[PDB]
Coordinates of C-alpha atoms and ligand atoms in Angstrom, one line a residue:
Chain A
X1 CA 0.0 0.0 0.0
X2 CA 3.2 2.2 -0.2
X3 CA 1.9 4.9 -2.6
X4 CA -0.9 6.2 -0.4
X5 CA 0.2 4.8 3.1
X6 CA 3.5 6.6 3.3
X7 CA 2.0 9.7 2.0
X8 CA -1.0 9.5 4.5
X9 CA 1.4 9.9 7.5
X10 CA 3.1 12.8 5.8
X11 CA -0.3 14.5 5.3
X12 CA -1.1 14.1 9.0
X13 CA 2.1 15.6 10.4
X14 CA 1.7 18.8 8.4
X15 CA -1.9 19.3 9.8
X16 CA -0.6 18.8 13.4
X17 CA 2.3 21.2 12.6
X18 CA -0.3 23.8 11.5
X19 CA -2.4 23.4 14.8
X20 CA 0.7 23.9 16.9
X21 CA 1.7 27.0 14.7
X22 CA -1.7 28.7 15.5
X23 CA -1.0 28.3 19.4
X24 CA 2.5 29.7 19.1
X25 CA 0.9 32.7 17.1
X26 CA -2.0 33.6 19.4
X27 CA 0.2 33.7 22.6
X28 CA 1.7 36.9 21.5
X29 CA -0.5 39.7 20.1
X30 CA 0.0 43.4 19.2
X31 CA 1.5 45.9 22.0
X32 CA -0.3 47.5 24.2
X33 CA -2.7 50.5 24.7
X34 CA 0.0 53.0 25.4
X35 CA -0.6 56.2 23.4
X36 CA 1.4 59.4 24.0
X37 CA -1.7 61.7 24.5
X38 CA -3.1 59.5 27.0
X39 CA 0.2 59.1 28.9
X40 CA -0.5 62.7 30.1
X41 CA -3.9 61.5 31.3
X42 CA -1.8 59.4 33.8
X43 CA -0.8 62.3 35.9
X44 CA -4.4 62.9 37.1
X45 CA -5.0 59.1 36.7
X46 CA -3.0 58.0 39.9
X47 CA -4.8 60.4 42.2
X48 CA -8.4 59.7 41.4
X49 CA -7.9 55.9 41.3
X50 CA -6.5 55.8 44.8
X51 CA -9.0 58.4 46.1
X52 CA -12.4 57.8 47.3
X53 CA -14.3 59.5 44.5
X54 CA -15.3 56.8 42.0
Chain B
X1 CA 6.4 14.1 64.5
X2 CA 5.6 13.9 60.8
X3 CA 1.9 13.0 61.8
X4 CA 1.4 16.1 64.0
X5 CA 3.0 18.5 61.3
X6 CA 0.7 17.1 58.6
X7 CA -2.5 17.6 60.6
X8 CA -1.4 21.1 61.4
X9 CA -0.8 21.4 57.6
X10 CA -4.4 20.3 56.8
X11 CA -5.7 22.8 59.3
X12 CA -3.4 25.6 57.9
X13 CA -4.7 25.4 54.4
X14 CA -8.3 25.3 55.6
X15 CA -7.6 28.7 57.4
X16 CA -6.2 29.9 54.1
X17 CA -8.8 31.1 51.7
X18 CA -10.7 29.1 49.1
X19 CA -10.0 28.4 45.6
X20 CA -11.9 28.5 42.3
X21 CA -12.0 27.2 38.8
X22 CA -12.7 28.8 35.3
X23 CA -11.8 28.2 31.7
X24 CA -9.6 30.3 29.5
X25 CA -11.4 32.0 26.7
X26 CA -8.5 33.9 25.2
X27 CA -4.9 34.9 25.8
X28 CA -3.7 38.5 26.5
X29 CA -0.1 39.8 25.6
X30 CA 0.3 41.8 28.7
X31 CA 1.5 38.6 30.5
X32 CA -2.1 37.9 31.4
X33 CA -4.9 35.5 30.4
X34 CA -8.7 35.9 30.2
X35 CA -10.5 33.4 32.4
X36 CA -14.2 32.9 32.6
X37 CA -15.2 31.6 36.2
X38 CA -18.0 29.3 35.9
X39 CA -20.8 30.8 38.0
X40 CA -19.1 34.4 37.8
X41 CA -18.0 37.1 35.3
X42 CA -14.8 37.3 33.1
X43 CA -11.5 38.4 34.6
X44 CA -8.1 39.2 33.2
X45 CA -5.8 38.1 36.0
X46 CA -2.1 37.4 36.4
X47 CA -0.7 34.0 35.8
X48 CA 1.1 31.5 38.0
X49 CA 4.9 31.7 38.3
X50 CA 5.4 28.2 36.9
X51 CA 3.7 28.7 33.5
Chain C
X1 CA -30.6 47.1 69.5
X2 CA -28.8 44.6 71.8
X3 CA -31.4 41.9 71.1
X4 CA -29.9 41.7 67.6
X5 CA -31.9 40.4 64.5
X6 CA -32.4 36.8 63.6
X7 CA -32.7 34.7 60.5
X8 CA -35.3 32.1 59.7
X9 CA -35.2 28.7 58.4
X10 CA -37.3 25.6 58.4
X11 CA -35.9 22.2 59.3
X12 CA -35.4 20.7 55.8
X13 CA -34.7 17.2 57.2
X14 CA -33.5 15.5 60.5
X15 CA -29.9 14.2 60.3
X16 CA -29.3 13.7 64.0
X17 CA -30.9 14.9 67.2
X18 CA -27.6 16.8 67.6
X19 CA -27.3 18.3 64.1
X20 CA -30.1 19.3 61.9
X21 CA -30.2 20.5 58.2
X22 CA -32.2 23.6 57.8
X23 CA -33.1 25.3 54.5
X24 CA -32.3 28.9 54.9
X25 CA -34.8 31.5 53.7
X26 CA -31.8 33.6 52.9
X27 CA -30.6 30.9 50.5
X28 CA -28.1 28.0 50.8
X29 CA -28.7 24.8 53.0
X30 CA -26.8 24.6 56.2
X31 CA -26.1 22.2 59.0
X32 CA -26.5 24.0 62.2
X33 CA -26.4 22.9 65.8
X34 CA -29.1 23.4 68.5
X35 CA -29.0 25.3 71.7
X36 CA -30.5 24.8 75.1
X37 CA -32.9 27.6 74.5
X38 CA -34.8 25.5 71.9
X39 CA -36.4 22.2 72.6
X40 CA -35.3 19.3 70.4
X41 CA -38.4 17.3 71.5
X42 CA -40.3 20.0 69.4
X43 CA -37.8 20.2 66.5
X44 CA -39.1 17.8 64.0
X45 CA -39.0 17.7 60.1
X46 CA -40.7 20.7 58.4
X47 CA -41.0 22.8 61.6
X48 CA -40.2 26.5 61.0
Chain D
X1 CA -20.8 12.1 43.2
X2 CA -22.7 12.5 46.6
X3 CA -23.4 15.1 49.3
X4 CA -20.5 16.4 51.4
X5 CA -19.8 18.9 54.2
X6 CA -17.8 22.1 53.6
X7 CA -17.0 24.4 56.5
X8 CA -18.6 27.9 56.4
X9 CA -15.5 30.1 56.5
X10 CA -12.9 27.8 55.0
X11 CA -15.2 26.7 52.2
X12 CA -13.3 23.4 52.2
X13 CA -14.2 19.8 52.7
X14 CA -13.8 18.8 56.5
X15 CA -16.4 16.1 56.8
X16 CA -18.7 13.8 54.9
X17 CA -22.4 13.1 55.2
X18 CA -24.7 10.3 54.1
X19 CA -26.4 10.9 50.6
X20 CA -29.5 9.6 52.4
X21 CA -30.1 13.0 53.9
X22 CA -30.3 16.1 51.6
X23 CA -32.8 14.2 49.4
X24 CA -36.5 13.6 50.0
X25 CA -37.8 11.5 52.8
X26 CA -37.5 7.7 53.0
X27 CA -40.9 7.2 54.6
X28 CA -43.7 9.8 54.7
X29 CA -45.3 8.5 57.8
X30 CA -43.7 6.4 60.5
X31 CA -41.4 3.6 59.4
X32 CA -43.3 1.0 61.3
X33 CA -46.9 0.6 60.0
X34 CA -49.9 2.1 61.9
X35 CA -52.1 -1.0 61.9
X36 CA -50.6 -3.6 64.3
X37 CA -53.9 -5.6 64.6
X38 CA -53.5 -6.0 60.8
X39 CA -56.3 -6.4 58.3
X40 CA -53.9 -7.8 55.7
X41 CA -52.8 -10.9 57.8
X42 CA -56.6 -11.3 58.9
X43 CA -57.9 -10.1 55.5
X44 CA -56.9 -11.8 52.2
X45 CA -54.1 -14.0 53.4
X46 CA -54.4 -16.1 50.3
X47 CA -53.8 -13.3 48.0
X48 CA -51.0 -12.1 50.3
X49 CA -49.1 -15.4 50.1
Chain E
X1 CA 1.8 8.9 -6.5
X2 CA 3.6 11.8 -8.2
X3 CA 1.2 14.6 -7.6
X4 CA 0.4 13.8 -3.9
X5 CA 4.3 14.2 -3.7
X6 CA 3.9 17.6 -5.3
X7 CA 1.4 18.7 -2.6
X8 CA 4.0 17.6 0.0
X9 CA 6.7 19.7 -1.9
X10 CA 4.5 22.9 -1.6
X11 CA 3.1 22.4 1.9
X12 CA 6.0 20.8 3.9
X13 CA 8.7 23.4 3.1
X14 CA 6.5 26.6 3.2
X15 CA 4.5 25.5 6.3
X16 CA 7.4 24.2 8.4
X17 CA 9.4 27.4 7.7
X18 CA 6.3 29.5 8.9
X19 CA 6.3 27.8 12.5
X20 CA 10.0 28.3 12.9
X21 CA 9.8 31.9 11.7
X22 CA 7.1 32.8 14.3
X23 CA 9.0 31.2 17.1
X24 CA 12.3 33.1 16.6
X25 CA 10.4 36.4 15.9
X26 CA 8.7 36.4 19.3
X27 CA 12.2 37.0 20.8
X28 CA 13.2 39.4 18.0
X29 CA 10.3 41.8 18.5
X30 CA 11.6 42.7 21.9
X31 CA 15.1 43.7 20.9
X32 CA 14.7 46.9 18.8
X33 CA 13.3 49.0 21.7
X34 CA 14.7 49.5 25.2
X35 CA 13.0 52.7 26.4
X36 CA 9.9 54.9 25.6
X37 CA 7.4 52.2 24.7
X38 CA 8.9 49.9 27.5
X39 CA 8.4 52.8 30.0
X40 CA 4.7 53.4 29.0
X41 CA 4.0 49.8 29.4
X42 CA 5.6 49.7 32.7
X43 CA 3.3 52.4 34.2
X44 CA 0.2 50.8 32.5
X45 CA 0.9 47.7 34.7
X46 CA 1.4 49.8 37.9
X47 CA -2.0 51.5 37.2
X48 CA -4.0 48.4 36.2
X49 CA -4.4 46.2 39.2
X50 CA -4.7 42.4 39.3
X51 CA -7.5 41.1 38.6
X52 CA -9.6 43.2 36.4
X53 CA -13.4 43.0 36.6
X54 CA -15.1 42.9 33.2
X55 CA -17.5 45.7 32.2
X56 CA -19.8 46.5 29.3
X57 CA -20.1 50.1 28.3
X58 CA -23.6 51.3 28.0
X59 CA -22.9 54.8 27.1
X60 CA -20.4 57.7 27.3
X61 CA -21.2 61.0 28.9
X62 CA -19.0 63.6 27.3
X63 CA -17.2 65.0 30.4
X64 CA -14.6 62.3 31.2
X65 CA -17.2 59.7 32.6
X66 CA -19.4 57.0 31.4
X67 CA -22.0 54.5 32.7
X68 CA -21.3 50.8 32.6
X69 CA -23.5 47.8 33.4
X70 CA -21.2 45.0 34.8
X71 CA -21.8 41.5 35.9
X72 CA -21.6 43.2 39.4
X73 CA -25.2 43.7 40.3
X74 CA -25.3 47.5 40.7
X75 CA -24.3 49.8 37.8
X76 CA -21.5 52.4 38.0
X77 CA -20.7 55.8 36.9
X78 CA -17.1 55.1 36.0
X79 CA -14.6 57.6 34.6
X80 CA -12.7 57.3 31.2
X81 CA -9.1 57.7 32.3
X82 CA -5.6 56.5 31.9
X83 CA -4.4 55.1 28.5
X84 CA -7.8 55.3 27.0
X85 CA -9.5 57.9 24.8
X86 CA -13.0 59.2 24.6
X87 CA -12.9 58.1 20.8
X88 CA -11.2 54.8 21.5
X89 CA -14.4 53.8 22.8
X90 CA -17.8 53.4 21.1
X91 CA -20.9 52.5 22.9
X92 CA -21.9 48.9 23.5
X93 CA -18.2 47.8 23.3
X94 CA -16.7 45.7 26.2
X95 CA -14.3 47.5 28.5
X96 CA -11.9 46.6 31.3
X97 CA -12.4 47.9 34.8
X98 CA -10.2 48.4 37.8
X99 CA -11.1 46.1 40.7
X100 CA -10.7 48.5 43.5
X101 CA -12.4 51.5 42.0
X102 CA -14.1 51.0 38.6
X103 CA -12.5 53.0 35.9
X104 CA -12.1 52.3 32.1
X105 CA -8.4 51.6 31.9
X106 CA -8.6 50.7 28.2
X107 CA -10.0 48.0 25.9
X108 CA -8.2 44.8 24.7
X109 CA -11.5 43.1 24.0
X110 CA -13.5 45.0 21.3
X111 CA -16.5 42.8 21.2
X112 CA -14.6 39.7 22.5
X113 CA -17.2 37.5 24.1
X114 CA -17.9 33.6 24.1
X115 CA -20.9 33.9 21.8
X116 CA -18.5 35.7 19.3
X117 CA -16.2 32.8 19.7
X118 CA -18.8 30.1 18.8
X119 CA -19.9 32.4 15.8
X120 CA -16.6 33.1 14.2
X121 CA -15.1 30.0 12.7
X122 CA -11.6 29.2 11.2
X123 CA -12.7 25.8 10.0
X124 CA -12.5 24.7 6.4
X125 CA -15.8 24.6 4.4
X126 CA -17.0 21.0 3.7
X127 CA -17.9 21.8 0.0
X128 CA -16.0 24.1 -2.3
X129 CA -17.6 25.4 -5.4
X130 CA -20.3 22.6 -5.6
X131 CA -18.2 19.5 -5.2
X132 CA -21.2 17.4 -5.1
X133 CA -23.4 17.7 -8.1
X134 CA -27.1 18.3 -8.5
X135 CA -29.0 21.6 -7.8
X136 CA -27.3 23.5 -10.5
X137 CA -30.1 26.1 -10.9
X138 CA -30.7 26.8 -7.2
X139 CA -27.0 27.9 -6.7
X140 CA -27.3 30.2 -9.7
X141 CA -29.9 32.0 -7.6
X142 CA -28.1 32.2 -4.3
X143 CA -25.1 33.6 -6.3
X144 CA -27.1 36.2 -8.0
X145 CA -28.3 37.6 -4.6
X146 CA -25.3 37.0 -2.2
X147 CA -22.0 36.5 -4.1
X148 CA -22.7 38.9 -7.0
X149 CA -22.9 42.3 -5.0
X150 CA -19.8 41.4 -3.2
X151 CA -17.8 40.5 -6.3
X152 CA -19.1 43.4 -8.6
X153 CA -21.1 46.2 -7.1
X154 CA -20.7 48.2 -10.4
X155 CA -23.1 46.2 -12.5
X156 CA -26.1 47.1 -10.0
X157 CA -25.2 50.8 -10.4
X158 CA -25.6 50.8 -14.2
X159 CA -28.8 49.0 -13.6
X160 CA -29.9 51.8 -11.1
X161 CA -31.4 49.3 -8.7
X162 CA -30.5 48.8 -5.0
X163 CA -28.6 45.6 -4.4
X164 CA -30.3 42.6 -2.5
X165 CA -30.0 41.8 1.1
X166 CA -30.1 38.2 2.3
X167 CA -31.5 34.9 1.2
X168 CA -33.8 32.3 2.8
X169 CA -33.1 28.6 2.2
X170 CA -36.1 26.4 3.0
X171 CA -38.1 23.3 2.3
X172 CA -36.8 19.7 2.3
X173 CA -34.3 17.9 4.6
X174 CA -31.4 16.0 2.9
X175 CA -31.0 18.4 0.0
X176 CA -27.9 20.2 1.3
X177 CA -29.2 23.7 1.6
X178 CA -26.9 24.1 4.6
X179 CA -24.0 23.0 2.4
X180 CA -24.6 25.3 -0.6
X181 CA -24.3 28.3 1.7
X182 CA -20.8 26.8 2.7
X183 CA -19.9 26.4 -1.0
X184 CA -20.9 30.1 -1.9
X185 CA -18.9 31.3 1.1
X186 CA -15.7 29.5 0.0
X187 CA -16.1 30.8 -3.6
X188 CA -16.1 34.4 -2.7
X189 CA -13.5 34.0 0.1
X190 CA -15.9 35.9 2.5
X191 CA -16.1 35.9 6.3
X192 CA -18.4 33.1 7.4
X193 CA -20.5 33.0 10.5
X194 CA -21.6 29.7 11.6
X195 CA -23.7 30.9 14.4
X196 CA -26.8 28.8 15.1
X197 CA -30.0 30.5 16.0
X198 CA -30.7 28.0 18.7
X199 CA -27.6 28.9 20.7
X200 CA -29.0 32.1 22.1
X201 CA -31.7 30.4 24.0
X202 CA -31.4 29.0 27.5
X203 CA -33.8 28.5 30.5
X204 CA -32.3 31.5 32.3
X205 CA -33.9 34.7 31.3
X206 CA -32.9 38.1 30.1
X207 CA -29.5 37.0 28.6
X208 CA -30.8 36.5 25.1
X209 CA -31.5 40.0 23.6
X210 CA -27.7 40.8 24.3
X211 CA -26.7 38.0 22.0
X212 CA -29.0 39.1 19.1
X213 CA -27.2 42.6 19.2
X214 CA -23.7 41.1 19.3
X215 CA -24.2 39.2 16.0
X216 CA -25.0 42.4 14.0
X217 CA -22.4 44.3 15.9
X218 CA -19.4 41.9 15.0
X219 CA -20.6 41.2 11.5
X220 CA -20.3 44.9 10.7
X221 CA -16.7 45.3 12.1
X222 CA -15.4 42.5 9.8
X223 CA -17.7 43.3 6.8
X224 CA -17.7 42.1 4.1
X225 CA -19.2 39.1 5.6
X226 CA -21.7 36.5 5.0
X227 CA -23.8 35.7 8.1
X228 CA -25.5 32.2 8.4
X229 CA -27.9 32.0 11.2
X230 CA -28.7 28.3 10.8
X231 CA -32.1 26.9 12.3
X232 CA -34.1 30.1 13.1
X233 CA -37.1 27.9 13.2
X234 CA -36.8 27.0 16.9
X235 CA -37.0 30.8 17.8
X236 CA -40.1 31.0 15.5
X237 CA -43.7 31.5 16.5
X238 CA -43.7 28.5 18.8
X239 CA -43.3 28.7 22.7
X240 CA -40.5 27.3 25.0
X241 CA -42.8 26.0 27.7
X242 CA -46.5 26.0 28.5
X243 CA -45.9 26.3 32.2
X244 CA -43.1 28.7 33.0
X245 CA -39.5 29.4 32.6
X246 CA -39.5 30.7 29.1
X247 CA -42.8 32.6 28.3
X248 CA -40.8 35.7 27.6
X249 CA -37.5 34.4 26.0
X250 CA -38.6 33.4 22.4
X251 CA -40.7 36.5 22.2
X252 CA -38.0 39.0 22.9
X253 CA -35.3 37.2 21.1
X254 CA -37.0 37.0 17.7
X255 CA -38.3 40.5 17.6
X256 CA -34.9 41.7 18.5
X257 CA -33.4 39.9 15.6
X258 CA -35.7 41.5 13.0
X259 CA -34.9 44.9 14.2
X260 CA -31.1 45.1 13.8
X261 CA -31.2 43.5 10.4
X262 CA -33.4 46.2 9.0
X263 CA -31.6 48.9 11.1
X264 CA -28.3 48.7 9.5
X265 CA -29.6 50.3 6.4
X266 CA -30.7 48.3 3.4
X267 CA -27.2 47.0 2.7
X268 CA -25.9 44.6 0.0
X269 CA -22.6 44.1 1.9
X270 CA -23.7 42.1 5.0
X271 CA -25.9 39.3 3.8
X272 CA -27.9 37.1 6.1
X273 CA -28.9 33.5 5.5
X274 CA -31.8 32.0 7.3
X275 CA -32.0 28.3 7.2
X276 CA -35.4 27.0 8.3
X277 CA -37.5 23.8 7.9
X278 CA -40.5 25.9 6.7
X279 CA -42.3 29.1 7.1
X280 CA -44.9 27.1 9.1
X281 CA -42.4 26.9 12.0
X282 CA -41.9 30.6 12.0
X283 CA -44.2 33.6 12.1
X284 CA -46.5 34.2 9.0
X285 CA -44.8 37.5 8.3
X286 CA -41.1 37.8 8.8
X287 CA -39.7 41.2 7.8
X288 CA -41.3 40.8 5.1
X289 CA -40.7 41.3 1.4
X290 CA -38.6 43.8 -0.8
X291 CA -36.0 43.5 1.9
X292 CA -35.1 39.8 2.2
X293 CA -34.7 39.0 -1.5
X294 CA -34.6 36.0 -2.4
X295 CA -36.6 32.9 -1.3
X296 CA -35.4 29.5 -2.3
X297 CA -37.5 26.5 -2.2
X298 CA -35.7 23.3 -2.1
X299 CA -37.6 20.2 -3.4
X300 CA -36.4 16.7 -4.3
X301 CA -33.9 15.9 -7.0
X302 CA -35.4 14.9 -10.4
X303 CA -34.0 12.1 -12.6
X304 CA -31.3 14.5 -14.0
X305 CA -30.4 16.1 -10.7
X306 CA -30.0 12.7 -8.7
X307 CA -27.9 11.2 -11.6
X308 CA -25.4 14.0 -11.0
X309 CA -25.3 13.5 -7.2
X310 CA -24.8 9.8 -7.7
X311 CA -21.9 9.9 -10.3
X312 CA -19.7 11.7 -7.8
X313 CA -20.0 8.9 -5.1
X314 CA -19.7 5.8 -7.3
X315 CA -16.4 6.8 -8.9
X316 CA -14.8 7.3 -5.5
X317 CA -15.7 3.5 -4.8
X318 CA -14.2 0.5 -6.5
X319 CA -15.8 -0.6 -9.9
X320 CA -18.7 0.7 -12.0
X321 CA -18.2 -1.7 -14.9
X322 CA -20.4 -4.2 -13.1
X323 CA -23.7 -2.4 -13.1
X324 CA -24.2 0.6 -15.5
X325 CA -24.7 4.1 -14.2
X326 CA -28.2 4.2 -15.8
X327 CA -29.2 1.0 -14.1
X328 CA -28.9 2.6 -10.7
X329 CA -31.0 5.5 -11.6
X330 CA -33.7 3.3 -13.3
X331 CA -34.2 1.1 -10.2
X332 CA -34.4 4.1 -7.8
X333 CA -37.4 6.4 -7.8
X334 CA -37.2 10.1 -7.0
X335 CA -35.9 11.0 -3.4
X336 CA -33.7 13.6 -1.6
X337 CA -30.0 13.6 -2.0
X338 CA -29.4 12.0 1.3
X339 CA -31.1 8.8 0.0
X340 CA -28.7 8.7 -2.8
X341 CA -25.6 9.0 -0.4
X342 CA -27.3 6.4 1.9
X343 CA -27.4 3.7 -0.9
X344 CA -23.6 4.1 -1.5
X345 CA -22.7 3.8 2.3
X346 CA -24.8 0.6 2.6
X347 CA -23.1 -0.7 -0.7
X348 CA -19.8 -0.2 0.9
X349 CA -20.8 -2.1 4.1
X350 CA -22.1 -4.9 1.9
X351 CA -18.7 -5.2 0.3
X352 CA -17.3 -5.6 3.8
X353 CA -20.1 -8.1 4.6
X354 CA -18.8 -10.4 1.8
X355 CA -15.2 -9.4 2.5
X356 CA -14.6 -8.3 -1.0
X357 CA -12.4 -5.3 -2.2
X358 CA -14.8 -4.6 -4.9
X359 CA -18.2 -3.3 -5.0
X360 CA -19.8 -6.2 -6.8
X361 CA -23.2 -6.3 -8.7
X362 CA -24.9 -8.1 -5.8
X363 CA -23.9 -5.2 -3.4
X364 CA -25.5 -2.5 -5.7
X365 CA -28.7 -4.3 -6.1
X366 CA -29.4 -4.9 -2.3
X367 CA -28.3 -1.4 -1.2
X368 CA -30.9 0.1 -3.7
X369 CA -33.9 -2.0 -2.3
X370 CA -33.0 -1.2 1.4
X371 CA -33.4 2.7 1.2
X372 CA -36.7 2.4 -0.7
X373 CA -38.1 0.4 2.2
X374 CA -37.7 3.1 4.8
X375 CA -39.2 5.9 3.4
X376 CA -42.1 4.0 1.6
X377 CA -45.6 4.7 0.4
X378 CA -47.7 2.5 -2.0
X379 CA -51.1 4.1 -1.9
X380 CA -50.1 6.4 -4.7
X381 CA -50.5 3.2 -6.9
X382 CA -53.0 1.7 -4.6
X383 CA -55.6 4.5 -5.1
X384 CA -54.9 4.2 -8.8
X385 CA -54.8 0.4 -8.9
Ligands
ATP1 N1 -26.4 20.7 -4.6 C1 -25.9 20.1 -3.6 N2 -25.0 20.5 -2.7 C2 -24.6 19.8 -1.7 N3 -24.8 18.5 -1.4 C3 -25.9 18.1 -2.2 C4 -26.4 18.8 -3.3 N4 -27.4 18.1 -3.8 C5 -27.5 17.0 -3.1 N5 -26.6 16.9 -2.2 C6 -26.7 15.7 -1.3 O1 -27.5 15.9 -0.2 C7 -26.9 15.3 0.9 C8 -27.5 15.6 2.3 O2 -27.2 16.9 2.8 P1 -27.6 17.2 4.3 O3 -28.0 16.0 5.0 O4 -26.5 18.0 5.0 O5 -28.9 18.3 4.2 P2 -29.8 19.7 4.6 O6 -30.9 20.0 3.7 O7 -28.8 20.8 4.9 O8 -30.4 19.3 6.2 P3 -31.0 19.4 7.9 O9 -32.5 19.6 7.7 O10 -30.8 18.0 8.4 O11 -30.3 20.5 8.6 C9 -25.4 15.6 0.7 O12 -24.5 14.9 1.5 C10 -25.3 15.3 -0.8 O13 -25.1 13.9 -1.0
MG2 MG1 -29.1 21.6 7.3

């Protein structure tokens, strides 16, 4: 059965490689939320968060 | 001696707070993961030091 | 103010004459003791 | 899978319970029968055998 | 032998390289920067506590606050502050709150929810460009409505007409209405949404109308799209229960579905597909024509149509020299396309039964008589004779 048999296992390993590839990919995504005009919002941001006002 | 330390050990962890159980819905790149606790809301919470 | 409010249950089901399972009206089932200020000759299943 | 006891503050398993309580009752009246004269031993024994 | 090797030549080297490339790059990303971006990140982590309670943004009041409704029972007037903008948010989007004192500390969700996860799919379609024959005509009607605006919008503009919105596939079971929609979706290379209409409904109340909103909300972000809400029958006219625990749920959920389909605008860029057993398991008016064009009634393969389905199957199984193609058709009388596939599965089991490696003449003949026997009526020719 050598024409299809050998080539069957070879098919299978590629699919498994592709599944593994997707779990490597999704564990790192695009950085972060940091934006220079809302880094200036941070100055006021520490005080209100720690305070009793919201 | 081993028998007394272990009973104290059983007792110790009961005094420590409870534990829970969720399932990860998605992965975050801030070094966090998004967990959905089974009777409760979603939380993005820091991960264990061993994983 | 010093009396302090109380919670009601109903005896869900006898488990011992020492320990009794109550069904809380507040919610969850509990196993609770008994005191010497209640008669356990008059606790019986389904008594409030 | 069965009933079990958890402590209230620990919220951890410290004791175990029968599964025979926490369900519905085993006998709705008294476990021993009310009639002790009987009208089952006296009345249709043949059918009762 | 030679061409399955050629598939291996293309897939092994390119794919294996791709895994390895990702894996080094995850390290490599880090190395270009060493200040500025690192710093900003560092203070984002000081600000945002651990854990974060989820929120849902109801609405933004323009003054550096907002109102959220959260899985925490009381609502909150939260503030918009720290690494978030007023215009980085839109209403109805999912937000991240600070555990201690609720504040929108940014978004990393943007309509990330479990019902979204079921709905989006990364799966491969089962059929690609009508792999299995029969129903040639019906696909040249789905395609006119659904595929054709996406591929060429220009042609509708010369015509001066508005372009269609949605299709309704209905009628017979075993005719592969649910598979033609999958075919059409692969042909275009559109975004496909396998959500099922029955997966919004649960005993517990009041959850459902959120779910109906989220479908239309996500579909528009990733537009162009094809949305398939499969099995919208169950949420039809019918009731959950005749006692309790569901008197409301079906009623709110359906109504809420019609509303956000129309409310988009009359678009020809987000199509919907309603798959349903009949219009007798739904309400008598839907939403209700001029707006939902076109309606496709599936009925049973005819002698031409069922030939076509059959020829596909028989060639993928050993022999056809034994019993002519025509002789299979002749023996069969008209039935759905499942009954045609069923005869071939049974034929194959019969070759196993004998312990042959050929589908012999005897196997074909028995397999044909079996299916006809299920699935039987004889009072068509009994009234007559
Ligand atoms: N034009 C076609 N496209 C796809 N498959 C077809 C076509 N015509 C006939 N078939 C046949 O019909 C078979 C049955 O399809 P399937 O059972 O999925 O039906 P359905 O109408 O979507 O059903 P349900 O009511 O069970 O959701 C296919 O496996 C195939 O053999
Ligand atoms: Mg179907």
